[model samples]
Target: SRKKMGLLVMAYGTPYKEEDIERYYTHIRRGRKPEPEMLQDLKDRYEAIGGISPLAQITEQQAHNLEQHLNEIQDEITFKAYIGLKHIEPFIEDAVAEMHKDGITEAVSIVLAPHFSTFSVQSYNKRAKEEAEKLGGLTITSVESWYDEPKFVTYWVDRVKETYASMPEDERENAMLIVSAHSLPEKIKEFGDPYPDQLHESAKLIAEGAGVSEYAVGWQSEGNTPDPWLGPDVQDLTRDLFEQKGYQAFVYVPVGFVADHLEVLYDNDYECKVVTDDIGASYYRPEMPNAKPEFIDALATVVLKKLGR
Candidate 1:
C-alpha cells in the first residue's frame, strides 16, 4: 500500500483583519499588551498596506501548491499539506490535529523560513512533535534548513541577474547589488548559532552565481532592543552605499524569505524605497518566489531529500 504522508508547513502568522491586530501583536508580545502608540503605529502600517498582510493567503496557496507538487512527483507516497501558523488561528497544533484526523501518521514539517535557527525552525518542529505525540503519535520528519537546496539557490541567482539586467542602462555605471536577511540579536552568536554564518554562506553562493564579483552583506528588520542585533541594517547600508561608496542605483536581494509579506512589502517597498527615493537614488528588490512552479519544485526536493525515500 502507498504510504499516506502529511506535509505540515508553517509560517509566522499575521492578523487576519483590523480588529485582530491587537490580539496578534499581544500574542507576539507574549500577552503583554503593547503601549497605545505602539499599537497605533502597527495599525497605521497595516492601513498603509491595505489593512492586512497577504501572508495568510499567500501561505495557503504555497501549501496547496506544494502538496500537489509532492503528490505528482512521488508515486510511492501520497501527500497532503497543511497550513499552520506560529501565532494566529490554524496554529501548528490545529494542523497537527487535522493530520491526525485524516489518519496521516507520517509527516514532514518545514517552516517558511529557508535558513534554520534553533530559535526559529527548531522551535517549530518541537511544536509539531509535541502536538503529534498528543494526537496518538505521528512520525514527523522536519526539514531543518533548505537554504542550500540547489534549485532554491538558483532561483535566487536568477532573480539577482534579472534585477541587475533591468536597471536603466543610464544608471548602470554606478549600480550595486546587496543581499540581506532578517537580523537576530548578536547574543545568539555566543551559543555558536549558525544563523549569521549560513546567511553569508548563502550570500557568497548567490553573489558568485549571479556573476557579481562583490556584493554587500547586510541585515534587515532587526528587533529594537537595548542588546545588540546584527550589524549595519540594510537601510543604513543602502544609504551609506549611496553616500559613501558612491553607488547610485541598487538592487537588494532578500535571500531569507519565500513570499511577499509585511517585511518585504512594507519595510522594503515603502520604508526603504522612500529613503532611497528621498536621496535621489533608486532602489530595487527582485520579486519573491511566491507559489511559482520553480519554487514549488524546490520545496518538493527539500522534502524528498529529507525523507530519503
Candidate 2:
C-alpha cells in the first residue's frame, strides 16, 4: 500500500496594493465596512514593510525547512508541503483543490498560528474543512494547536532572551516586557469566547520559557468600534510602563503572532513605537519566528506529534 502524505500550512494573509485595501477589507469584514482607522492603520503598516508582506514566502520556507528535517529523521514519507493564505493569493480553498488535483490523499493540516482559540486557529480549520468537503477524498489530520509544545516554548524563549541581551546594557535593564496579541473584542469574551484567556496562557508559557519574572501581557492591533476590545491595549500598557511605573524602555513580544506582518509592522513598529518614543521610553521589538530554523523544527515537531509520527 502506498501513502500519499501532504502538508498544508495555512496563514492569515495580506494584500500588497493600496488599491486592494477595500477589497481585502471586504474579505476580513465578511461584507461589512471596516473602520476607517483600522483600514488606514493597515495601509500605513503595509507601506512601511515595503508595500508587501513576505509572510506567504516565509511560510513556504518554513514548510520546506520542516520537510528537510522530516527527511533527515529517516521517516522517508511521501510528503510535500504547500502554503495556503487565507485572504490572499493561493487561498485555502484553491490550494486544497490543487492538491486534490495532484492526487494527494493524506493531509497533515497546520495553521501558521501557534495558539489555540476558537476565534483564531479555528477559522483556518473551518475553511480547511469546507474545502476538504468540497474535494471529498483527502484524509485530514489537523494539528489544532501547539501552544504548549516544548520546542515552541524553547524557541520563543531563546529568541526573546537573545534579542533582549543584544540591547544596550542600560536599556536592557530599563526594558519592560510587553506581550501582545491581536485583540478579541470584549463582546466575544462576554459571549464565552476563550481567545483572550487562551492568548494569556500562551503568553504565560512563552514567558516561563523565557525565564522572565517581570512582564505584562497586552492586546494590540485592535479594530475600532464602540464595542469594547480586550485590554489593556498596547498603548495603555506602554503608558503604564512610563507614567504609572516610570519605566523608560520597552520590548514588545508578539506571543500570538509568529511572524511579522501588518499587525507587527503597523501596530507594534509604528503605533507602539510612537507611544514609547513620545514618553521618552527606549523601545525595541523582538524578531518574529517566521522561518527561523529552530522555530521551523518546532513546527515540524508539532505536526509530527499530532500525526503520531
Candidate 3:
C-alpha cells in the first residue's frame, strides 16, 4: 500500500519567549517548578542569548528540508514531517496523535540529538511508541542513532577544521580540541547505559574524520544534581590544560546537541568562556548544526534508512 508516512522530527523544546520560561521549566522538570533563584538565573541565560533560543526555528527548518528531501528521493511514499517537542506545546504525544489523525500509520521518528541513551533518545522513542499505541493504528520506528552518518561526520569535520584554521598562530599552537556532550546523572551507570560510550565513540569518529591528531573527550551542561556526572567537563578541562599542561587555547565541539540553544549559546559561549578567560586562555567552538543543508540531508538519510525506498 502507498500509505503516507510521518517523518517525526523530535527535540527537547525551548520556550518561545521570556514569559514562557517558568512554564517551560516546570514542564521540563516534569511538573516540579524550579526555585525562585534558579528561575531567575534561567531567565538571565535566555536574556544573555537574546531572550530565547533558536532551537524552534532551526528544528522547523530541518523538518521542512527533511520533508523536501524525502519526497524528492522516493515517489512511492507520501512524506509528511511533524515537529514534536518533548516539554512544550505540540509534544511527542501531540504529534503522534496528529499523525494518526492525518492518516499516517507508519512513522520514522528521529530525535535531533544524535547519540542514543535509554534516558534520552530511548525515552523519546518510547514516548512516540506509547502514544501510537494509544491512538490504535500508528506505528513508529525510530532512527535511534545517526552520529556517524556520512553527511553528519563531514559537517563536524569541516566546521572543526575551519575553526582551527581561523585561530591565531600562537593560540592555535597552544590549542587542543575538546569534543563534548551534555552529561547525564551518574545514576545512569547503574543501568549500564550506552550514553557515555556513544559520546566517546562520536568524539573519536569526529576527531579522526577531521584528521585531528589528538583531542579530549568532555561533557557539559551538567545538571544541578547531587550525583556525579560525566567528565572531564569541557570548561574545567580548559582550565586544567592551561594551569597544569600550559595549553593556552581551547577548541570545543558539541557532538551531542543539534542547534544553538541555551546550552550552547549561554552555557558554553558565555559560562564556559568566562572560565577560559579567567585563566587567560582562549575558547573556540564550531556552531551547532542549525539546519545546515548537509545536516538536513543527513537527517533525511536517517529517515530513509529506516523507512526504506
Candidate 4:
C-alpha cells in the first residue's frame, strides 16, 4: 500500500488571547481548575507579555515551511503536515482526528523540543499514539531526539554569536554567557531522566561552536508545584554571576527551546531582566529560532531521516 504520511508537529500550546488563559491553564493541570491566586498569577504573566502568545502562529509557520521543504524533495509517500498542541486547541487527539479524516495511514510525530524527557516528549508521543490507535492504530514513527543535529546545533551557535556581538565592544569581553532551559522537578533525577544531562551536552556543543571558553548552565521557568524543581534557578545564577563571580554583563541563551512563548517572553525577557538590573548588570537573550528557514530546514531533515529517505 502506498504510504500517506502526516507530519504531526507537537508543542506546548499557549492561549491566543487573555480570555483563553483559564481554559488553557485548566487543560495543563489535567482538568483541575486553578485557584484564584494561581489563575491571577498566570493572568499577570500573560498580561506582562501583551495578553497573548505568538506560539501557535509560529508553529503553524514552522509546519508550513517544513511541509513545503519536504514536498519539494519528492518522496515515495505523499506528505502533509499538521500542528498538535498538548494543552490547547488543535489538541493532539484533535490533530489525529483530522489526520484520520484526511486519510493519513502512516505518520511521524515530531515534538519541537530537541531534548527528550519522560515528563515531556514521551508524554506527548503517548498522547498522539493513543489517539492514533482509536482510528484502528495508524502506523506512527516518532523523532525521539535531535539535540545534536548539525543544523539545529549550528543555528544556536550563530544565534549566540549574533547576540554576543550585539553587545558594546568593551562590555562584550566582560559579559558572561549563560545557557538556560526550563527546569523540571529535582525528583526527575531519581527516575534517571536524561533531560538535564542532555541540556548540558547541548550547551557544551553550542558554546564550543560559538567559540566560547567560559560559560554557565542554569534552569528557569520552574512551576509552582510544592515539590522541589531544578536549580540553581536562573535568577539565583544571575545574582551569583554578578555578586560572586563579579561578572559585569550577562548574555542569556535559551538553548532548550525552539520558539518564543511565555517562558521566553516574560520569564526570561521581563522577569530575568529585572534580576540583572537589580544586580547592577546588563542582561541579553539571543533570539529563538522561530519559523526561521534554518530551523524549518532542520525540522525537515529530522522528519526525512525518520522516514528513511
Query: Each candidate: what lDDT?
Result: 0.85, 0.78, 0.84, 0.85
Each candidate structure's TM-score, on Cα atoms with residue i matched to residue i, is 0.94, 0.88, 0.95, 0.93
Q: Give lDDT: candidate 2, residue 277.
A: 81
Q: Please, what are the lDDT tens digits per residue for candidate 3 over residues 252-303?
A: 8888988888888887898778988898878887878887778888888777
Per model, state how many residue pairs clash: 0, 0, 0, 0
Query: What lDDT score is found at residue 206 in candidate 2?
Result: 71
- State the number of backbone clashes in model 2: 0
Cα error, residue 120 of model 4, in Å, equals 0.8
Tens-digit per-residue lDDT, 95-136, candidate 2: 788888899887888888776667667877888778888879
Question: What does the lDDT come to for candidate 4?
Answer: 0.85
Clashing pairs in 4: none
Q: Is candidate 1 or candidate 3 better by lDDT?
A: 1
Query: How do the residues 15-101 of candidate 4 rate in per-residue lDDT, one tens digit apiece?
Result: 887788889888877788999998888888877776575656888888888888878766576678988998888888999999989
Candidate 2: list runs displaced more than 4 Å: 16-19, 32-44, 53-55, 167-170, 190-192
Error of 4 at 88 (Å): 1.0
